[PDB]
Amino acid sequence: QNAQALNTLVKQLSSNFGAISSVLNDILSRLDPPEAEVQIDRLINGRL
């Protein structure tokens, strides 16, 4: 059970939660701040 829970928590990092990308660097490079900060906010909420 402990290993299953840890694996689920680790695998949750790859989701998009509705954002453009699951990598912060791609969001930073592909967009300007006034929307990159919104996408990062979405990702932050999901991981919290």
């Binding site: 694996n7 680790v10 695998k11 790859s14 660097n25």
Partner: protein, 246 residues
Amino acid sequence: VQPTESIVRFPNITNLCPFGEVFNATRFASVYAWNRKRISNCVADYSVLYNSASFSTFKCYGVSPTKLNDLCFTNVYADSFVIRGDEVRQIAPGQTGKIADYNYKLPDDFTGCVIAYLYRLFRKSNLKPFERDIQSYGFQQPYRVVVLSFELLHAPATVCGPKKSTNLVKNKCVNFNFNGLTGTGVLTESNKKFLPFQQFGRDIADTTDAVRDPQTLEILDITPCSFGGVSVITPGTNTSNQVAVL
């Protein structure tokens, strides 16, 4: 542990597109019979043309010569024709006159760089952008001008500017960006064996584990830099002020 040095490595920027076929050739066609040159399947290195000496003008429209090395486009056209010095302004978005409305009309929304001969004096309709609908002018000065029209479509793009696939590149103990791979960690020579078409390795957690050197096709293990919490050991302050950390 913070990264020490960032030796980010990318292979040689090869091959080189034949810019010299137009920018550096010996023959330029007439303005009313201009030749459009199609550029594809090559690395468009604009530094050589931007830094080339003996250029009368170097005019960019919506682009930057230092930036064009980092733009990838599907199709790029190299318009080459002979024009005189006084009418060199006719190759411009929205400019009017004999040459633009009769010989070579540049789009009012043109994007690219213009770097620098028969007069048509009678027309029935103004020429469209990049239109060639075919009075003799005697050169008793001529200016060889090349127009770089950058067109991007939904097709895959073939002319960017940077290295393509297969060149020389190195690796060190770095922070450790190579090619499309990023992130910090220490690199160690690996005994793993990749298939010839395999470039990455991944753990059960879908995390990057090993990477193959693009030049000398060897595989390196990726071990991340150390980290951990810090704790402070102390008796009561009413006994001493000494501490020990772990």
